[PDB]
Amino acid sequence: ATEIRASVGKMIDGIGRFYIQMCTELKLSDYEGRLIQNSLTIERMVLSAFKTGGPIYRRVDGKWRRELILYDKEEIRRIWRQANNGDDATAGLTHMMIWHSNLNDATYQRTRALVRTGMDPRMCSLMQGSTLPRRSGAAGAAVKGVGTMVMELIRMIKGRRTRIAYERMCNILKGKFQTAAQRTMVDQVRESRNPGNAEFEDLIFLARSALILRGSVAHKSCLPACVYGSAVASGYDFEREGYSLVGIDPFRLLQNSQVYSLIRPNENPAHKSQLVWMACHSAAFEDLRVSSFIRGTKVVPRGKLSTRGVQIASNENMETMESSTLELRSRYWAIRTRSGGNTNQQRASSGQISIQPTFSVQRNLPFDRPTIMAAFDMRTEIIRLMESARPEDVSFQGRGVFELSDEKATSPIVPSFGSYFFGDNAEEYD
Amino acid sequence: ATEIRASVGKMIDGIGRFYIQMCTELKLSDYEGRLIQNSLTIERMVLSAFKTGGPIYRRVDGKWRRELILYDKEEIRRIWRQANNGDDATAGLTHMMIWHSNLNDATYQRTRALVRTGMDPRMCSLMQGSTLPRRSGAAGAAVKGVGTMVMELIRMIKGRRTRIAYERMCNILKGKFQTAAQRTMVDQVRESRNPGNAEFEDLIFLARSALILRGSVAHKSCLPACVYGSAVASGYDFEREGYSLVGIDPFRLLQNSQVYSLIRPNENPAHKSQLVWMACHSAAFEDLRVSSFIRGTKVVPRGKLSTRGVQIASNENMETMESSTLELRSRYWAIRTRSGGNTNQQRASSGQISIQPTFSVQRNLPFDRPTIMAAFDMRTEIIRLMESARPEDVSFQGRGVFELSDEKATSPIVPSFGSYFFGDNAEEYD
Amino acid sequence: ATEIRASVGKMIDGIGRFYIQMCTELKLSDYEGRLIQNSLTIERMVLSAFKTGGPIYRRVDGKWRRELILYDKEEIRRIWRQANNGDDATAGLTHMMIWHSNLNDATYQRTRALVRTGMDPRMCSLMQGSTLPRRSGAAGAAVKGVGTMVMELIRMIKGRRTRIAYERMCNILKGKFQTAAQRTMVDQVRESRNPGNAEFEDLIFLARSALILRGSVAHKSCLPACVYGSAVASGYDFEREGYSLVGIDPFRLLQNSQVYSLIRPNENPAHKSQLVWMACHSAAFEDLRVSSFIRGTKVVPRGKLSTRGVQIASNENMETMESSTLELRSRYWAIRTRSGGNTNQQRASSGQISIQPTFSVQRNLPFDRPTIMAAFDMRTEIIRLMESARPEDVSFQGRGVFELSDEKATSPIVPSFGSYFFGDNAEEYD
Numbered sequence A, B, C: 001a002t003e004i005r006a007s008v009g010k011m012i013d014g015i016g017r018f019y020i021q022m023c024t025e026l027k028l029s030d031y032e033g034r035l036i037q038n039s040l041t042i043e044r045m046v047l048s049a050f051k052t053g054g055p056i057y058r059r060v061d062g063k064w065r066r067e068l069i070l071y072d073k074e075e076i077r078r079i080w081r082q083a084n085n086g087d088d089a090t091a092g093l094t095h096m097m098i099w100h101s102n103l104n105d106a107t108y109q110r111t112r113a114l115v116r117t118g119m120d121p122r123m124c125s126l127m128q129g130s131t132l133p134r135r136s137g138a139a140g141a142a143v144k145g146v147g148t149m150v151m152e153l154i155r156m157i158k159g160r161r162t163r164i165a166y167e168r169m170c171n172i173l174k175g176k177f178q179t180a181a182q183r184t185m186v187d188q189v190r191e192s193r194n195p196g197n198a199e200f201e202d203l204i205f206l207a208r209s210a211l212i213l214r215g216s217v218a219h220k221s222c223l224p225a226c227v228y229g230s231a232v233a234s235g236y237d238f239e240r241e242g243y244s245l246v247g248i249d250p251f252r253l254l255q256n257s258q259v260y261s262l263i264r265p266n267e268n269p270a271h272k273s274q275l276v277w278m279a280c281h282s283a284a285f286e287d288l289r290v291s292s293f294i295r296g297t298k299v300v301p302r303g304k305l306s307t308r309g310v311q312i313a314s315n316e317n318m319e320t321m322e323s324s325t326l327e328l329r330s331r332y333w334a335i336r337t338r339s340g341g342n343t344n345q346q347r348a349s350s351g352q353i354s355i356q357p358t359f360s361v362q363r364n365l366p367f368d369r370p371t372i373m374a375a376f377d378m379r380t381e382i383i384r385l386m387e388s389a390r391p392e393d394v395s396f397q398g399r400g401v402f403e404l405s406d407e408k409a410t411s412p413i414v415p416s417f418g419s420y421f422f423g424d425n426a427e428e429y430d
Ligand SMILES: Cc1cc(Br)cnc1N1CCN(C(=O)c2c(-c3ccccc3Cl)noc2C)CC1
Pocket: A231, A235, A236, A237, A249, A250, A252, A253, A256
């Protein structure tokens, strides 16, 4: 833990020093450095570098102005290495990619790409890290969802270093599955010589199963570089204090930060805020109920958000652009989990699925129909297993949210209970 | 459109002139002519004529009095032909039958007739135009529901002009089905020589399918004759202005009309009003949600309506009868559709049917169970097709309600969302 | 009825005289005699007698004190016989056992015992009278649930008087089943020579079926002995007035009684009250909706009750114990039923399970999916039968609740509509 917090603390400290350096280069005011659109361009530039540029937004005579500029990749690559105490520091780079991955996950549906891969577009909840490059970091692998891994595997299916890269991705997917049955099917896809349609059919099956028997997918609060830099500048030592991606730290940092955003004419700044909050705590595919309870205010579905993406395109004119504060704080916090929830055990039950009439009164007599009727080769084992699962089943027994002052997660608050962020479009009402 | 509005405008103009004529014959006051019970008798008389009579209600010394009278069928038949500029005018007649059909559809469940035909009594939503005579008009055919057509077909199954009338009804049903699979099954029932139990079994199957893969059934706002007549009298020219059954016109006319009803001691006039509003816009089997949103006030299920039928029987005594205004106006309007909604296409999906846990918090993990589990000869094609359908699926993408001033349907309002009018009795709570 | 009310009135009159006698022996004040914990010990002592003792709670110098004492079984057995006018009076004894059975049914989940018997722990609603001894009274047999009978039958399966006791329990279970198919399966378990796994598998099947096709299980309001005794003492004659266990009498008696309870530091007295009210009217496995409507205030699930059991263990210290009034009255009353609801008939339907679109408006088009899709050896007959059942189906047509003044059940009030008491734990949210 101390050792982990030490290295994490270093890479966040690196990103910070880099951002401050980059902010002085461009001669940006502190406020300007803390504009989200400016942070994303600077983040983009260091990622492309490993000519490079993008739009940078300044404040001249009461109006927001765009001014795209370019740098040498070598100059940036030099500035990054040196902000990270000599080392090449690839870890801090994939941390900015995962942040971009998370914001993409909240902003865009990847339906157009799912159909090409022959996948059900209703698998979006399985698509964490889909806009993340194949062969990302170890951190990138961890964050990638079951569906993402399946999609990457099909692209391959559809040069003996190709076979090892195939087996690598199979093992990444296998390690994510929490049941033996699901894992044995991955062995049958990996062990296959010259993969084709059978493996395609198998991976589509496995994806569907992961909607019920969920895979272990890592979640990491990753913040725009301007949040870290602003903290390094203001006198916070990430190396002496350490840092966590899954503990309280990102929540605490956001509670001590103020980021800004460019907002368009018709857009609701509160809705823009939800989007960046969701991305910040990797929450695109969380239950809206749990997000809402943590944040304090309601977390509304994508289709009910009166907002477009964070990035302002080259097309649109700056004259109508205004700048708003992003509300990125929370009521409570919670530990970010690697778990997909309970998949097996099946240790007893405890519950009630029907009633026995005591009073002679006119009424319907409720019963849990799917569950009662349910109880009446590896695919067969999988089907039977996911037929046993009920939406009513509770995962993460005992674990709860925490107050912002409870840094050591001493006193968990267990909450009393629309769930899907992407279940509200012109074709479906979920 | 202009040509259609021209003929529609003429037949509504005919009905108007007829009603005014009939109102002067009976020496009725304007108010009395606009009593719904009086309109229904006059409507009945011209339909029977093609001795004939019924109850007529007057206002003598502060009390409502019933006074049944009879006319020569020939005299009525003469009065109808002449109000319709010489022509026999059968179209205007079937328009009054469809109005009666719609009021029946809202007033009575046809369960007793469904059981005799060997049909599930839960098919009421398929029963538009069931009280409409076999071999009605072309308009009558259009308005008749899938279930109605099936019921008529069984009565036949249970004289070579019998075979053509059989094939006619098959084609009416076929034209209503929006899938190839459903249509090919109708060919197999029609092509059959000497129909029997196989065809009975096939048509029962087809009826069940039409609850999910819905048929194209026409909907026509048809108003009591007293509404049209009152407009002709007050100076409205249906021929110069044209008229529509599916556009704004009936809504606009109702917004400029005042009809009355006889109300019994225990009855809620507001509930009586809902019933006649439902009948007026052919809405017996609509989603109560959409009816409520259009009308402005809640549209309550039949079992929660403290009202009986519009017609006051010969048995009941007039001394307790009072007269109320029927509230037949709306907040908005909407185009009446021929469509049954989306049945096929299956072009991608876009949506979310599960969640991925981000926070370590005690909770259930929702998922759309029927949908996920779903994906695991013409009857087989039909079953597979209706197993793909979800109640969550959206039909009529882009189309919405309109303000009463938007005559050209320029600006659609898409609404934000109990659905069944007949799902609230002593045996079922739907 | 008069004859039944006569004998019931006698046994309740016996229990009363016994309790008063026992209260004078222990030199208890009236208030103390009406403390629920004191009533349960006295009840326990007469049941064990047929050395015996338990805790008795007094009020000394502003503090509650525990003082366990013992009696001769023979002395108690003498006191019971004589309070019941000479007779041995076993009936009044099983009435106190059924009361304890009901309080257990409300207090404890029997999941740990269900798993040992190889039964689904979600069958709790079938477990009325599980803590009641095998071979109880005839009254005890009636009150025992389908699941209880199955559990007892397995214990047997897992000395030719063993065979008759086996056949006896089979007949008790058979008489409870409301369908022929379920009854014929019980014949196949009973007729079996040397029972084993086939019978185990059959009885588990039968238990599952009874969640949908419910068995006829008796329900009896049985009150703590202190309620009866307090009424005998205050001048009520149960023998002249008669008494009922299923009519108005227990409701009326509770409305004229005041019982007390020992309450722990953290406990909500209102929640303690719900628990004893539930036990009093045998309502552990009723729909919470109907319980709430009758009682007047909400009847909360077990997991949301901030209370533990009624009995205060020898471990816990009395110094923190305070005494509260138990709120055991109701808004209305209802007849306690022997019926499990409608299981067959299938006489038509009457209802609506889909809609037909009238307006061209963007929306989902609801339909009852399970019901529509449903319609597409004795076990097979059972499966098909329970596949026809819908949670929406109405049982007890016409029957309703009554005002406390309507003793003759003249005017039934039919109510307008969380259902499970045990569907709210750390593993399931039902
Ligand atoms: C930014 C931040 C990020 C994370 Br992850 C957690 N904690 C954070 N802060 C740091 C600043 N902070 C203060 O109260 C301070 C400090 C201060 C400075 C550093 C450490 C502690 C303290 Cl207390 N020095 O002056 C004031 C005033 C609030 C908590």
